[PDB]
Amino acid sequence: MSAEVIHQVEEALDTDEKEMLLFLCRDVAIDVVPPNVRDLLDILRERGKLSVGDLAELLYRVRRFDLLKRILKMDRKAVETHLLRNPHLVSDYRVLMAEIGEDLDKSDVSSLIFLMKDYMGEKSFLDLVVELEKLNLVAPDQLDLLEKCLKNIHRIDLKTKIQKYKQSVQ
Amino acid sequence: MSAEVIHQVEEALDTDEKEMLLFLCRDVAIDVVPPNVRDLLDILRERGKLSVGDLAELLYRVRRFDLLKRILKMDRKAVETHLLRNPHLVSDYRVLMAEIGEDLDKSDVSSLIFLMKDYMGSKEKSFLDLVVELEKLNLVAPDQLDLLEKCLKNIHRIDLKTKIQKYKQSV
Amino acid sequence: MSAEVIHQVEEALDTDEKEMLLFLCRDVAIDVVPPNVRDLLDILRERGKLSVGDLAELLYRVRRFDLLKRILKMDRKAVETHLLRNPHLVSDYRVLMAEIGEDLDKSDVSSLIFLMKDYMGRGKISKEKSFLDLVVELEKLNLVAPDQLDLLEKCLKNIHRIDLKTKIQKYKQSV
Amino acid sequence: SAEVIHQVEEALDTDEKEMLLFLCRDVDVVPPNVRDLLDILRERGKLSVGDLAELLYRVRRFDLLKRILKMDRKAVETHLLRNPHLVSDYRVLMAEIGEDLDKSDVSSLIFLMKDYMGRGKEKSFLDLVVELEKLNLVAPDQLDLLEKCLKNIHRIDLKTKIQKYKQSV
Amino acid sequence: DFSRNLYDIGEQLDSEDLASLKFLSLDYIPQRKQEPIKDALMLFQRLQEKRMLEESNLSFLKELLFRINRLDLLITYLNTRKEEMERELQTPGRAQISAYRVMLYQISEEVSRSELRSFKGGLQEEISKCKLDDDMNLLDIFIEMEKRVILGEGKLDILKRVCAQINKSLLKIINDYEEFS
Amino acid sequence: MDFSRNLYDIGEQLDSEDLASLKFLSLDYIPQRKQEPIKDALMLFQRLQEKRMLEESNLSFLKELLFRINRLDLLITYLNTRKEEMERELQTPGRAQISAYRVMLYQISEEVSRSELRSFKGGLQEEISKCKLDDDMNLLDIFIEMEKRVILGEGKLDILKRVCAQINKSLLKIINDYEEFS
Amino acid sequence: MDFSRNLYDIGEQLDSEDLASLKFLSLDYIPQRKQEPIKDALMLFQRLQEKRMLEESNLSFLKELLFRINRLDLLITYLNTRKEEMERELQTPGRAQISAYRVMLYQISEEVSRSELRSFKGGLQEEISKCKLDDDMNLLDIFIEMEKRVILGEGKLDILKRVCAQINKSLLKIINDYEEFS
Amino acid sequence: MDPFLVLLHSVSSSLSSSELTELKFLCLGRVGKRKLERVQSGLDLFSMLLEQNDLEPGHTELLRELLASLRRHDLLRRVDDFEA
Amino acid sequence: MDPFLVLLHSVSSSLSSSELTELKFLCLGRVGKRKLERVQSGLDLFSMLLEQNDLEPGHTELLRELLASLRRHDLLRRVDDFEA
Amino acid sequence: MDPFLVLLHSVSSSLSSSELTELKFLCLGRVGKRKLERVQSGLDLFSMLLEQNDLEPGHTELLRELLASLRRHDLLRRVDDFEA
């Protein structure tokens, strides 16, 4: 709504939170890719897509309820009801990717990198996902290359999440 | 009453106490998140909130009395009287959390995080980091202490529950 | 003199005596805290407070007389005369603390930290400690001082070790 | 055979790039990008598949030799005997020595060499040979200072390697 | 179909086996690149770099797994038997690992903790007190001896004398290795 | 009702020896690399939770594990299961998630005293010769070591029988009872 | 400072057997896992302090423990309590923080001879099945092992009655007195 | 106290095997059989009895009462001289 | 090679198990029970008593008093010959 | 020197545990208690003594009198024959 609110929001976040938000806003940033999160917020504001509900949605998707209550004077229930009523800006596929990436270990992601380096030509799971998307191998409609890869590393728990998402969308 | 005592304070304190100092000063600097201690002290000095009494109180909270006797040339009784008369900067909540985190050994924080994994998402993860993370989700606040008290009571640590209840009785 | 002798001394000391040397050198270099022996020796050399006599005195205090002959080509008589004719590099309080800490085994530091659990923290002493670390912790809390030793003497008497109490009495009578 | 340079350089590592730059230091501002070397060698006419193969064999990346240049170790070894003058053997010896020191050894070496060197800092062994060359004391003919400093940290096999190289030429 | 098998093989190697393989691969892996290695996957990738371990060529990994006396991985994943491995290693032209490393590793196996302390207590003249540390493994002592060119292929006098001072059994291994060589 | 609280209470009743026994029994479903840093029951419970073998809805594996180490107290204090129910459940084929080989080896380990242990260790030198002669090696560790060198396996039980017949006879009875299945 | 000195001096006068008896008497208030590292009375005192049952102004549990193991000189020397003063306090209901079951088991343990211990092992070996045939284990370990396998429960006492009747008679007298108490 | 301990040692030094067995049978009521099982000398029995506070330096009537069963008046006179 | 230390060693080398048990009981007043539990030879007991400063080379009345109870005249003779 | 070191190792390799703790007590004054606490073998104690250069090939009388106090004349004879 105002420049100082978004400036405070950008100042109060963390580098990992900034990177996660930048990845999560990839779908809406197809036309222009802001290198900085402040640039992304400015672009969203200039296009009118940065609203109170939208900002609440992004802040809720990064689990920062303290900033939600301290700035927007809103709680979890209100933003959840807004999500239920108002349409979601970002597809739940990105939310699933972020949730999966939040749980993998550094050794696990290194093993995943070693396994998947055959197809492709330090790196976090989000970097691997975006690089794979650049190579057009995993898409919001195809997830076998991820389900099988996750099952191969003996982390069968996230296969349940992937299949639950796949069943839910259809 | 100069600008070089700050550098000596930075030099003397090790990183283990510097983390506790950062946590204690976290609440007052509600809009800035400095990575180091020197920049935080500079920010406090520029804001004008930092003073000789404030620095003495901060160094007394960290329990480094030799610095008070050496740099500020002040005793513990004088600073205690100053605290009794001059209202304190850091709230009792932060020092209570620091005291709670001091007595929890490495074998209990793992049990606590295993218990609390259902509410959130031998690696060195101190209790201060865990309480900061819990504060991020708006679960532990100076008004809401039910979760921490219940968790401490459920892992066979009752004196800390007594401390929490005493703090609640104080207010 | 050069850095080669400092390196040779550094590589000839095990991890046990490194802590002893660090505790002994706290008085001389109090502005900053060095992590390892090499950094401490480099700082004292750069500041000019380190010389052949200082290193000889430190090696005499750490009770490693063989290294004096092997490296510095000096005997115990030379360092004794140097100490006699020159001011002490380390206060006698530090060497007294080191002497006390030499005679306390692992079965007594537990008793000490149990008796003095009220003054200091509980999670700090969970990790394996030695008497030197306990002295450092007490000195941080301004409980033990070069001119104040009643509490430590009483604590040593409580664990039924009369000889160390007599040693404290002797040192206090000396000053 | 012209745009494969990007493919070759994209499959390398940071320390590998540093070693490559040290090797190419024999041939001005140091170009972080290999394209300057490409242009210089193409203008000189020295650029060839054989030179790139020899460089890759020196940096021990045989997988890229087979994948990109479609050649094995035997082919590049045979081509080496044709004219092994792309890089001086002094550089090869220095790189081989630098590949045999861990973090503790390089830290001890820099601490020892700080005696008469100005306070310039985290760096590797290959980042100190350049400093000594700037001071111009490690000559390809005389290496007395390097051997004296290396003997103090108790590494005698490398001293024997230095002696063998010196007596060979 | 191939990388998954390598990952499976690398998921059943503990720290001790990793250290043993790291020591066994000293000639083909320089010391500097060895420090970052913290798991079997990194070592496998590094060996893949030097083109001595590919999908088609698996001899080096086979004999490396056979050397540390772990035949379970040989029979289960790599699908080979002990007898044919012995027959292949009998040929002098198919042993990538030199007999020096094998002999030193066997000596390391044959030494218990008390004999390890006996070794550590009889070489103060050679190795610095700092480098001993009273917790280093025997292989670290051997590589430290190799660094100071005290224990070479042609220089086995000090090892032989410390063996004769400590244990008679190790002398049997040393002298049969010498007789074979 | 708190699943995590129940798991923590179950894990607080297990000492180092029972932890080692639990680690050995479930060796099939967790590789040795992931099994090195396990120092308390909480880490093992988390590792089992990763592979979808232990959760709030499905407890069919924890009950079996607690039954096999004869810790029947926890089966009734926390999980509220009597011995007869577990016996009937294990009697029905297809619900035994642990092969009879591991439980047979564990029973042989339990049925050996200290003198029998040292006699077994001394007699083991016939075939595998000797790796290191420290007596600190428990029977489970020795069994794992022998399994690594394909000395002892599912179809290879001759060495175990040969060594056991020199010491006791009830072990032969256990081995024959196991062989009766085949 | 006085309280810490008193606790340390009390702990300095307890040998290994008394430490084992104290450890057994307080299984309810100390979990199995936290009890293994205990090697001296000081760690037990610290653990009791953590549970907030042994405080500067709350010394009832220490008096009860020192009275149960029949050490009265320590009671009169430091805590300044006589036998009758503690007996009157313990007689009234509601102030007993130790279950009558545990004290009954300990009283049975004190009144068993070595030959009676061997016969006790022989009598009930049908259930343990030679797992604990070693004769170096005292009666308390046997009782703990029987408690693990839900044989000797609070409401399940038939095995104990049968074995004690087979061995002697006074043990049955103590068991009957305990039953009459309930 | 030191005189009490030295007196107790002196009186325990003159005991015999039959006297020890008789004293054990007499004192079987106080303590359990296990506590009285491995005792091999009167000194060990006195050390055991010092725990139950029944034998104290202030009052030693139980000691003389126990010794009276052995018809050893010399020990009674010795302890009487001690307590004097 | 202190004369007092070697004398204490020689004295402790000539004791027996029963004498050691009697000495352990005798010194129960000063040394605690837990410390006395782990002793196995008189050398350890003498070393432990050296801490409380009651037994020192300057004054050796405690050793003479202890040896008087054991009625070992040879060891007392050695003790008094050491002083001269 | 190396012959001195091998002689020291050989003489340390033939000491019993009782003789080991006997030697540990016998050198109480020279070496602090903490260092003696972690000594497990005679060779380690010999190295600890050599650290203070009181024991060396140039002056080995201390080891001679130590072995004499140990009542092991064979080891003393071997040590005397070493320099011959």
Numbering used by the authors:
A (entry chain I): 1 to 121, 128 to 176
B (entry chain J): 1 to 121, 126 to 175
C (entry chain K): 1 to 175
D (entry chain H): 2 to 28, 31 to 123, 127 to 175
E (entry chain A): 2 to 182
F (entry chain B), G (entry chain C): 1 to 182
H (entry chain Q), I (entry chain R), J (entry chain L): 1 to 84
What does the paper say about this structure?
Fas-associated protein with death domain (FADD), procaspase-8, and cellular FLICE-inhibitory proteins (cFLIP) assemble through death-effector domains (DEDs), directing death receptor signaling towards cell survival or apoptosis. In this work, we present the crystal and cryo-EM structures of ternary FADD-Casp-8-cFLIP DED complexes, unveiling FADD-FADD, FADD-Casp-8, FADD-cFLIP, Casp-8-cFLIP, and cFLIP-cFLIP DED assemblies in a complex. The atomic coordinates depict how FADDDED and Casp-8tDED could assemble a helical 1:5 and 3:3 intermediate complexes, and how these FADD-Casp-8 intermediate complexes are targeted and capped by four cFLIPtDED molecules. The resultant helical Casp-8tDED-cFLIPtDED hetero-double layer appears to locally activate Casp-8.
To delve deeper into the assembly of the FADD-Casp-8-cFLIP complex, we conducted a study using wild-type (WT) full-length FADD, WT cFLIPtDED, and a full-length Casp-8 mutant with FGLG mutations, catalytic inactivity and processing deficiencies (F122G/L123G/C360A/D374A/D384A). This allowed us to reconstitute a ternary complex known as the FAFuL-C8FuL_FGLG_CADA-CF complex with an intact Casp-8 protease domain. To validate this observation, we produced a GraFix-stabilized version of the FAFuL-C8FuL_FGLG_CADA-CF complex and solved the cryo-EM structure at 3.7 Å resolution, named Complex B. Complex B confirmed the 3:3:4 model observed in Complex A, with invisible Casp-8 protease domain and FADD DD. Our triple-FADD complex structure unveils FADDDED-FADDDED and FADDDED-Casp-8tDED assemblies, by which three WT FADDDED molecules FAl, FAq, and FAr form a right-handed, type I interface-mediated trimer to interact with the left-handed Casp-8tDED trimer assembled by Casp-8tDED molecules C8a, C8b, and C8c. Notably, FADDDED interacts with the type Ib surface of C8tDED_FGLG DED2, although we introduced FGLG mutations on the type Ib surface, suggesting that the FL motif is dispensable for FADDDED-Casp-8tDED assembly. In addition, two FADDDED molecules FAq and FAr assemble like the Casp-8tDED molecule C8d in the single-FADD complex. Together they provide a type II and two type III surfaces, mimicking the type III-II-III CSS, for interaction with Casp-8tDED molecule C8c (d vs. 4e, f). In the 1:5:4 FAFuL_H9G-C8FGLG-CFH7G complex structure, three Casp-8tDED molecules C8c, C8d, and C8a provide, respectively, a type Ia, a type IIa, and a type IIIa surfaces, while FADDDED molecule FAl provides a type IIa and a type IIIa surfaces to complete the CBS to recruit cFLIPtDED_H7G molecule CFk. A similar CBS, which recruits WT cFLIPtDED molecule CFk (CFk-binding CBS), was also found in the 3:3:4 FAFuL-C8FuL_FGLG_CADA-CF complex structure, although Casp-8tDED C8d is replaced by two WT FADDDED molecules FAr and FAq. In fact, the triple-FADD structure demonstrates that FADD can physically impede Casp-8 filamentation at the upper end.
